[model samples]
Target chain A: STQPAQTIPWGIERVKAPSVWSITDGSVSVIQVAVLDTGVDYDHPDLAANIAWCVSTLRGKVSTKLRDCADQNGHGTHVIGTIAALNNDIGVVGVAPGVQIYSVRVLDARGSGSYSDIAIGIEQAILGPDGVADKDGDGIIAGDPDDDAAEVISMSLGGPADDSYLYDMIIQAYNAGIVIVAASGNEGAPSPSYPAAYPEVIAVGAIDSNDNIASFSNRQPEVSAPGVDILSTYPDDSYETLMGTAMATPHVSGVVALIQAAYYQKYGKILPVGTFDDISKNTVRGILHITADDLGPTGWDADYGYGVVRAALAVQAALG
Target chain B: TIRVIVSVDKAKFNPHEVLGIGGHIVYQFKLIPAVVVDVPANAVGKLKKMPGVEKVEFDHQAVLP
Candidate 1:
């Protein structure tokens, strides 16, 4: 019988970690990462300290009380857990351990919400004028404006639509320098999905434990992460395993936070707006493609995109 | 936006279902009998009055099978 592969350190073992670790630990400590999905389980022991804010578009505008942003469906908590769970003894650590999180509740308890709700959530994430102050300053509290100043946004939902209004909101957020990362839909084909299909966002697919493309993952992923039987924090002081691009997206978002933090420390300046454009999707396309350890065809096969995202190489290319 | 597939017992009466929120209607008939509507939370119950209406199913624009 073959010996089981030795497990690597929590964050470093993932391909995206090398690039993520280059920054000084506290560099992006002040930056906020906003997740617009099913609300997070704010009480999860591993995630409690990292939550900087939460907002529920569902609560009528007149209500001042901070509604519970707990993750009833568990998807949002899982995503947030992958990005910034506390580095404590009980559970997994995030890609950006020191970064803060902002949960924007766009999806409802059943893991479903309208496109408009998501659009509103995007607008809110970008510092919408009317409601922007940190109502509760616990750093993990919700309904506050201070939490709106997010440098990155991660959304793990997708479907088939050519809606221009939704596309416009994504562009608006991108123009404001927010890094938008979304899933490229779970359909296992080359045709793209909204937001992910849109040029302004980073579209991610999935990879498994051995770093091979998952059979159910969307084809042509921008990068890949550990999406198969991945474990993470949950609401009600519980934990669970999940699979999907929803689980895969945060790895890239956390990596971006890590990169942003490192870049800020190195230059004492915010990274350029529209780095996606500056880097050129094709360059991002090229970087992931060239750096990936070839899994299938000789070069650039459709199913795996650039083959799983090699974090160290992507960071080197992004930083340089 | 949500897309719904409505099926009626092969009716050919120019059946129309006015989407509750915006009065949008789908009158054409095709093999699948599908209609896409943007029903806000406030208008979900108002969709019951359309003629020859069988059932309405809601799906987000990004949902896949």
Candidate 2:
């Protein structure tokens, strides 16, 4: 704990993350969130220490080499940093500063990837380094601690089409107990983007420091987070300010890490996973919906699904 | 050559079966019952009708938004 205090970005503060650090600042041993985007800059000073694994599911290749998954586009780095940048004094911190980040690169330098690559990335997230989705051949992959699978999968990228192949993979990951989070979309359309639009994902919308919904955020998101002018770690050991539903997503993903970590610390076990309705209130997504800071209407609304995510409250709720 | 994902019944599927239909398997997913393949534009129809094939979808693009 020798790491000196660093600048806690406004968005981190907005989500009330610092208040929960005393309980559990998140832990690599407890949880790993797979960032499915353009490869990450694993060497970034603020990001390196927390990154536990790196792999690229691009061009029909699964490359484990660091160079293979290095961030060519700054978007992935920014998204990842917002989720788990180091708390060391030199730069900005993240929502779940101690959580392990697994780079599952699905996009190329242009920040564009095919549906197949994205699906493969999800598959890898489910399999982890062991490359086995079902370790015991029990036809189950989600709750087994033996599986090296990540507990959370964050996608800051999306498309307009609702491809079945990708949906099937999303379902597979969800069924395997991964908390899937995605950007609602930046089209400002009435509905969310493809995967976000899918019921399996916690579709996130963007909001500003003032908690005002961003104009470009697609409506009907599951939750909202700080996305306007969000300052987070960028590639080459730099920082940048960006806005999009993409930026909002990692905040929710990071919070999921904190909740899961806190839950594990208190309960001595991970939360059980099942179909959304099977035990909805017990799942991470269920917790998000109930604990969010309601905006818009009294209940769920189009603009903001539940409301801005409150990390401190979420962590406290998780302990119960 | 064009890339498309072929959904299949894993129990009845084999990589060689895709090859027999002029489709070169690119990625055989271990988690899901699907495979990515490269094949002639004309063979898409034939690939879809393969014994274990469920659906053949053209590879679509996703971008940062």
Candidate 3:
């Protein structure tokens, strides 16, 4: 719904300019992004056009039908909505409006799933339908066709770290050339969170409109975004405002897709697989440290890793 | 399930040292009793060499029924 009386916050407006400008210059395309969360509403008016694919592993098999794949808890919908909502005149536009979204129901309505199931989802998102071949049937093997299909994987869930098996799968996906972005946990602690704690994954923490780290956001935010009171697409054609690193993660993911598309169009060659990691790390470091409207300590501190994410500067850094 | 609680007189303690008795390095010391291997015996000695470390002790308590 359009709120005519209310002005889009300056932060959102600032971010919108770069995102929109980048898209207009053909910097990004209809890239496929797999949202591994609760689920997404397939029939949502704002999201229908951008949803290129949907898959549900509820029965241990890939199902394209929306019934089991639809967003039940609204978490996944909110995330997907932020990244790829259509540019229709109704709701707010997404960061990567031209990108395609694929729903991967890893978590249930309760916002949780077994570690093994989540691991399977990660492997499937990268390796494809059947997952990597497991000769011993121990479900620990590699080689799947989908490994080269999707370019980015967005994970907004995590729990206590008991084992590295799941993280190992993520590393496998990363090595396969998938950009893995994860939430830096809602817990406001100094210690790193699982998956996010893993060096391979791009860890993101949340920041509010005023560029202050949200109270619930963890201490080390690699890069910040408009997380607090941010409006985005939701299930059942509804819109909602929420705050968490979940929201911030997609913002970065969408930006990465944009960078990748622009790189391909300009150079006529896919950026090196490991390029995403290097660009993400360097761009994040450069943009935040260089242009951050400093709120906390001067340099990289426990609170804000570098500073709020500057999309324009980051895009420029990626291009250069 | 063995439990060991070692106390130190210093304001800050390095867990890697006390847990490094047998060439092992403690990676995570949160509520779990996990210890990593392959650390040198001089690991604790290095921590003891620090100016702030006063005393370092290791208490290995065997699991009891």
- Could you say which candidate leads in TM-score? 2
After superposition, the stretches of candidate 2 with alpha carbons farther than 4 Å from their true spots are A1-5, A137-143, A273-281
lDDT tens string, model 2, A204-277?
A: 99998888899999998888999899888887888888999999999999998898888877776666533323
Give the proportion of true interface contacts each model preserves, from 0 to 1.
Answer: 0.22, 0.91, 0.00
TM-score of each: 0.72, 0.94, 0.70
Q: How does chain B score by TM in each prediction?
A: 0.49, 0.89, 0.33
Q: B1-65 in candidate 2: lDDT tens per residue?
A: 79999899989878898677687989999877889999989888888788888888999988588
| lDDT minimum window of 10 residues, candidate 1 chain A | A1-10
Q: How accurate is candidate 1 locally (lDDT)?
A: 0.62
Selected candidate, larger DockQ, 1 vs 2: 2
Sorted on TM-score, highest at the top, how do the candidates line up? 2, 1, 3
**What does the lDDT read for residue A261 in candidate 1?**
65
lDDT of each: 0.62, 0.85, 0.58
lDDT tens digits, residues A172-271, model 1?
6665567788887776767546677777787777778876777778776655666777777666666667888888788778766766666566655445
Fnat score for model 3: 0.00
Candidate 3 per-residue C-alpha lDDT over A116-172 given as tens digits, one digit per residue, 9 for 90 to 100: 445556756764443432324442221222233466788777655635445556767
